[PDB]
Amino acid sequence: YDKWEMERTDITMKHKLGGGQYGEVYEGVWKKYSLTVAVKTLKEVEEFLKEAAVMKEIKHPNLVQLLGVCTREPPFYIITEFMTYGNLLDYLRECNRQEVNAVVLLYMATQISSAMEYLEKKNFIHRDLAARNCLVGENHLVKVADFGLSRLMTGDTYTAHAGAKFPIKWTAPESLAYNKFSIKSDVWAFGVLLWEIATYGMSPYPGIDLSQVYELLEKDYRMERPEGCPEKVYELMRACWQWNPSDRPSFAEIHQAFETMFQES
Ligand SMILES: Cc1ccc(NC(=O)c2ccc(CN3CCN(C)CC3)cc2)cc1Nc1nccc(-c2cccnc2)n1
Ligand SMILES: O=C1NC(=O)[C@@H](c2cn(-c3ccccc3)nc2-c2ccc(F)cc2)N1
């Protein structure tokens, strides 16, 4: 047992988080610090433990933070911080837009690009970047997470493809075509995430059937600039959606771009 192991009794387990929305994830309390936490449990063990191992290597203010694990006897736990306002997609859809205004949106985008710049530097790939996988805390804190939603979400967000489950409208073309994932396919998804933010959580390619998406992209179709979107933000989206992965900017470049816009605003 390493430095991450914590005693089961350190955590008060409360109810399942969001009525199964997240699978076997529970809201808990880290008693000694009076902090609310999220606790993922295991009803497969290999994948579970591999996740914990990845998380031990990630430390950034805009990434969900591992706090501990319980691995001595079942059920095993992965414990992370809990974020006050929950997932970004629902947050955007339900917020007061005078309060969560343009400067807040720029701040959120900046934080997300910072997280991704970090994963980029560490040679990690996210593979499912989207507003549904981000969390919002007080004072507009935003953290990137990965909830493993493809196997929990009901509806058309994820649909079968290449014998797997893909969120087609967030998926880079090369990932769709040749099942190739890289930090540049995350950059593509980040562009879609910008559009989610810009529209306060609309579904992308609205009114366009999933069946048409890949062909449209292949023939150079791209979502148009959302109402109220600054040209500079839209330029970033278009750069993220370059057909060729090597033509897309790095997260380092994206973050620098947003840093500048945020401070200017
Ligand atoms: C309890 C838990 C356990 C594991 C994780 N895991 C991650 O969030 C995560 C993030 C990044 C990576 C990095 N990884 C690199 C490799 N690629 C392929 C995948 C991504 C992995 C896991 C989160 C949580 N936290 C969590 N889970 C579900 C819901 C909530 C939650 C809900 C509402 C409010 N606050 C929190 N919180
Ligand atoms: O009504 C709106 N339309 C939008 O696109 C959004 C918006 C407005 N500004 C803005 C910024 C500065 C001045 C005026 C407007 N910046 C954004 C934005 C969109 C996506 C993103 F990731 C981050 C920010 N608000």
Please name the method used to determine this structure.
Answer: X-ray
Dist CA 260 CA 265 (whole Å):
9
Name the residue type at position 160. Answer: A
Q: Could you confirm whether 156 is annotated as catalytic? A: no
- How many residues belong to the chain? 265
96 token code pair = 């007061």
CB distance 150 to 165 below 8 Å: yes
Dist CA 92 CA 204 (whole Å):
14
Dist CA 110 CA 191 (whole Å):
13
| Cβ–ligand 1 contact at 127 (below 6 Å) | yes
Cα torsion at 93, 97, 99, 103 (round to 10°)? 100
CB distance 128 to 145 below 8 Å: no
Domains of the chain as residue ranges with CATH: 1-82 (3.30.200.20), 83-264 (1.10.510.10)
Say if strands 11-16 and 86-87 run parallel, antiparallel, or are unpaired. unpaired
- Ligand 1 atom 26: residue of nearest CA: 38
Task: Mention every residue, 6+ apart, whose C-beta is less than 8 A from residue 104.
Answer: 140
Residues facing 221 on adjacent strands: none
CB distance 70 to 5 below 8 Å: yes
Please name which of 54, 75, 76 lies closest in space to residue 66, comparing C-alpha atoms: 54
Annotate the chain with three-state secondary structure: CCCCECCHHHEEEEEECCCCCCCCEEEEEEHHHCEEEEEEECCCHHHHHHHHHHHCCCCCCCECCEEEEECCCCCCEEEEECCCCEEHHHHHHHCCCCCCCHHHHHHHHHHHHHHHHHHHHCCCCCCCCCHHHEEECHHHCEEECCCCHHHCCCCCCCEEECCEEECHHHCCHHHHHHCCCCHHHHHHHHHHHHHHHHCCCCCCCCCCCHHHHHHHHHCCCCCCCCCCCCHHHHHHHHHHCCCCHHHCCCHHHHHHHHHHHHHHC
User: Would you say 23 is a known binding-site residue?
Assistant: yes
The half-sphere exposure of 186 on its side-chain side, counting CA atoms within 13 A, is 24
Q: Cα-flanking dihedrals φ and ψ of residue 78, to 5°?
A: -115, 125
- The residue numbers preceding gaps of C to N over 2.5 A in the chain are 43
Please identify which residue in the block is written with the tokens 């953290």. Answer: 143
Dist CA 76 CA 51 (whole Å):
12
Pick the catalytic residue from 2, 90, 128, 186.
128
Residues facing 188 on adjacent strands: none
Ligand 1 centroid to Cα of residue 228, in Å, is 32
| Cβ–ligand 1 contact at 78 (below 6 Å) | yes
CB distance 134 to 83 below 8 Å: no
Dist CA 6 CA 2 (whole Å):
9
Query: Could you give the maximum distance between any two Cα atoms of the chain, in Å?
Result: 57
Q: In units of Å, what resolution does this entry have?
A: 1.9
Choose the residue to mutate in 196, 227, 233, 262 for probing ligand 2, maximizing ligand atoms within 8 Å of C-beta: 233
Please name which of 32, 48, 29 lies closest in space to residue 40, comparing C-alpha atoms: 48
User: Would you say 19 is a known binding-site residue?
Assistant: yes
- Ligand 1 atom 20: residue of nearest CA: 126
Please name which of 94, 134, 90 lies closest in space to residue 110, comparing C-alpha atoms: 134
Q: Based on C-alpha coordinates, what's the Rg of the chain?
A: 19
Ligand 1 centroid to Cα of residue 207, in Å, is 30
